[PDB]
Protein backbone atom coordinates (compact mmCIF):
# COMPACT_ATOMS: atom_id res chain seq x y z
CA UNK A 1 0.00 0.00 0.00
CA UNK A 2 3.02 2.27 0.84
CA UNK A 3 6.50 2.23 -0.80
CA UNK A 4 9.56 1.10 1.31
CA UNK A 5 10.96 4.66 1.94
CA UNK A 6 14.71 5.39 1.39
CA UNK A 7 17.35 4.86 4.15
CA UNK A 8 17.29 7.49 6.91
CA UNK A 9 19.78 10.37 6.45
CA UNK A 10 22.27 10.91 9.36
CA UNK A 11 20.79 14.46 9.69
CA UNK A 12 17.44 12.78 10.54
CA UNK A 13 18.57 10.44 13.43
CA UNK A 14 16.31 12.48 15.86
CA UNK A 15 13.15 11.53 13.86
CA UNK A 16 14.05 7.78 13.59
CA UNK A 17 11.89 6.30 16.41
CA UNK A 18 8.83 8.37 15.40
CA UNK A 19 9.02 6.74 11.96
CA UNK A 20 9.46 3.28 13.60
CA UNK A 21 6.32 4.07 15.74
CA UNK A 22 4.50 5.00 12.46
CA UNK A 23 5.59 1.70 10.82
CA UNK A 24 4.54 -0.24 14.01
CA UNK A 25 1.05 1.39 13.95
CA UNK A 26 0.29 0.97 10.19
CA UNK A 27 -1.95 -2.07 10.88
CA UNK A 28 -3.25 -1.14 14.42
CA UNK A 29 -4.06 2.67 14.87
CA UNK A 30 -3.31 4.16 11.36
CA UNK A 31 -4.34 7.64 12.64
CA UNK A 32 -1.22 7.30 14.93
CA UNK A 33 0.81 6.22 11.85
CA UNK A 34 -0.44 9.33 9.91
CA UNK A 35 0.42 11.93 12.58
CA UNK A 36 3.73 10.16 13.52
CA UNK A 37 4.77 10.55 9.89
CA UNK A 38 3.41 14.14 9.68
CA UNK A 39 5.51 15.13 12.75
CA UNK A 40 8.64 13.42 11.30
CA UNK A 41 7.96 15.25 7.98
CA UNK A 42 7.69 18.77 9.54
CA UNK A 43 10.61 18.02 11.93
CA UNK A 44 12.96 16.78 9.16
CA UNK A 45 12.03 19.77 6.93
CA UNK A 46 13.26 22.08 9.75
CA UNK A 47 16.52 20.04 10.19
CA UNK A 48 17.67 19.89 6.48
CA UNK A 49 15.53 20.29 3.33
CA UNK A 50 18.51 21.46 1.11
CA UNK A 51 20.67 18.27 1.05
CA UNK A 52 19.68 16.06 -1.91
CA UNK A 53 19.65 12.86 0.35
CA UNK A 54 17.30 14.63 2.86
CA UNK A 55 15.24 16.32 0.05
CA UNK A 56 14.56 12.90 -1.61
CA UNK A 57 13.63 11.28 1.77
CA UNK A 58 11.17 14.01 2.78
CA UNK A 59 9.40 13.82 -0.67
CA UNK A 60 8.93 10.01 -0.50
CA UNK A 61 7.64 10.51 3.14
CA UNK A 62 5.34 13.27 1.73
CA UNK A 63 4.06 10.66 -0.80
CA UNK A 64 3.22 8.15 2.03
CA UNK A 65 1.37 11.00 3.82
CA UNK A 66 -0.82 11.80 0.75
CA UNK A 67 -1.49 8.02 0.34
CA UNK A 68 -2.44 7.49 4.05
CA UNK A 69 -4.58 10.68 4.08
CA UNK A 70 -6.59 9.34 1.11
CA UNK A 71 -6.65 5.78 2.60
CA UNK A 72 -8.35 7.41 5.65
CA UNK A 73 -10.97 9.29 3.68
CA UNK A 74 -12.42 11.47 6.52
CA UNK A 75 -12.14 9.97 9.43
CA UNK A 76 -12.86 12.57 12.16
CA UNK A 77 -9.29 12.22 13.54
CA UNK A 78 -7.79 13.38 10.16
CA UNK A 79 -10.77 15.67 9.36
CA UNK A 80 -10.72 17.48 12.74
CA UNK A 81 -7.41 18.32 14.45
CA UNK A 82 -9.14 18.54 17.93
CA UNK A 83 -10.22 14.86 17.55
CA UNK A 84 -6.81 13.70 16.19
CA UNK A 85 -5.00 15.42 19.04
CA UNK A 86 -7.39 13.87 21.66
CA UNK A 87 -6.97 10.41 20.05
CA UNK A 88 -3.11 10.55 20.04
CA UNK A 89 -3.02 12.27 23.53
CA UNK A 90 -5.37 9.74 25.24
CA UNK A 91 -3.39 6.93 23.63
CA UNK A 92 0.01 8.27 24.88
CA UNK A 93 -1.40 8.97 28.35
CA UNK A 94 -3.03 5.54 28.71
CA UNK A 95 0.34 4.05 27.74
CA UNK A 96 2.12 6.30 30.31
CA UNK A 97 -0.35 5.22 33.09
CA UNK A 98 0.36 1.57 32.21
CA UNK A 99 4.17 1.88 32.26
CA UNK A 100 4.06 4.02 35.44
CA UNK A 101 1.95 1.33 37.20
CA UNK A 102 4.53 -1.35 36.19
CA UNK A 103 7.36 0.87 37.56
CA UNK A 104 5.54 1.48 40.88
CA UNK A 105 4.89 -2.31 41.06
CA UNK A 106 8.60 -3.03 40.43
CA UNK A 107 7.82 -5.01 37.28
CA UNK A 108 10.69 -4.06 34.91
CA UNK A 109 10.41 -5.43 31.38
CA UNK A 110 10.84 -4.56 27.65
CA UNK A 111 7.12 -3.78 27.28
CA UNK A 112 6.99 -1.19 30.09
CA UNK A 113 10.27 0.33 28.77
CA UNK A 114 8.73 0.56 25.21
CA UNK A 115 5.49 1.97 26.69
CA UNK A 116 7.40 4.74 28.51
CA UNK A 117 9.47 5.45 25.35
CA UNK A 118 6.52 5.35 22.89
CA UNK A 119 4.42 7.61 25.16
CA UNK A 120 7.23 10.27 25.20
CA UNK A 121 7.52 9.98 21.37
CA UNK A 122 3.73 10.46 21.08
CA UNK A 123 3.88 13.66 23.18
CA UNK A 124 6.48 15.00 20.66
CA UNK A 125 3.96 14.15 17.87
CA UNK A 126 1.08 16.08 19.60
CA UNK A 127 3.17 19.33 19.05
CA UNK A 128 1.87 19.35 15.40
CA UNK A 129 -1.49 20.52 16.88
CA UNK A 130 -0.03 23.20 19.17
CA UNK A 131 1.81 24.04 22.41
CA UNK A 132 2.09 21.32 25.04
CA UNK A 133 0.59 21.56 28.53
CA UNK A 134 2.89 21.62 31.58
CA UNK A 135 1.53 18.15 32.45
CA UNK A 136 2.42 16.92 28.91
CA UNK A 137 6.00 18.30 29.17
CA UNK A 138 6.44 16.72 32.66
CA UNK A 139 5.16 13.28 31.41
CA UNK A 140 7.40 13.32 28.30
CA UNK A 141 10.46 14.20 30.49
CA UNK A 142 9.64 11.46 33.11
CA UNK A 143 8.76 8.79 30.47
CA UNK A 144 12.01 9.34 28.53
CA UNK A 145 14.07 9.40 31.74
CA UNK A 146 12.47 6.19 33.15
CA UNK A 147 12.77 4.31 29.83
CA UNK A 148 16.53 5.20 29.56
CA UNK A 149 17.39 4.39 33.19
CA UNK A 150 15.45 1.06 33.22
CA UNK A 151 16.97 0.10 29.81
CA UNK A 152 20.50 0.49 31.28
CA UNK A 153 19.59 -1.17 34.68
CA UNK A 154 18.35 -4.15 32.51
CA UNK A 155 21.34 -4.25 30.03
CA UNK A 156 24.36 -3.59 32.40
CATH superfamily name and code, 1-156? Vacuolar protein sorting-associated protein vta1 (1.25.40.270)
Domain map (residue ranges) of the chain = 1-156
Quote the Cα angle for 22-104-154, to 5°. Answer: 65
**Taking a C-beta distance cutoff of 8 angstroms, is the pair 61, 36 a contact?**
no
Q: What method was applied to determine this entry?
A: X-ray
Q: For this experimental structure, what is the resolution in angstroms?
A: 3.0
SS (H, E, C) 38-87: HHHHHHHHHHCCCCHHHHHHHHHHHHHHHHHHHHCCCCHHHHCHHHHHHH
Amino acid sequence: ALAPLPPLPAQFKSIQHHLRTAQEHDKRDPVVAYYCRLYAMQTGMKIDSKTPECRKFLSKLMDQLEALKKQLGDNEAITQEIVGCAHLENYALKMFLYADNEDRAGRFHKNMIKSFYTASLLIDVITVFGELTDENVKHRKYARWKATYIHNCLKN
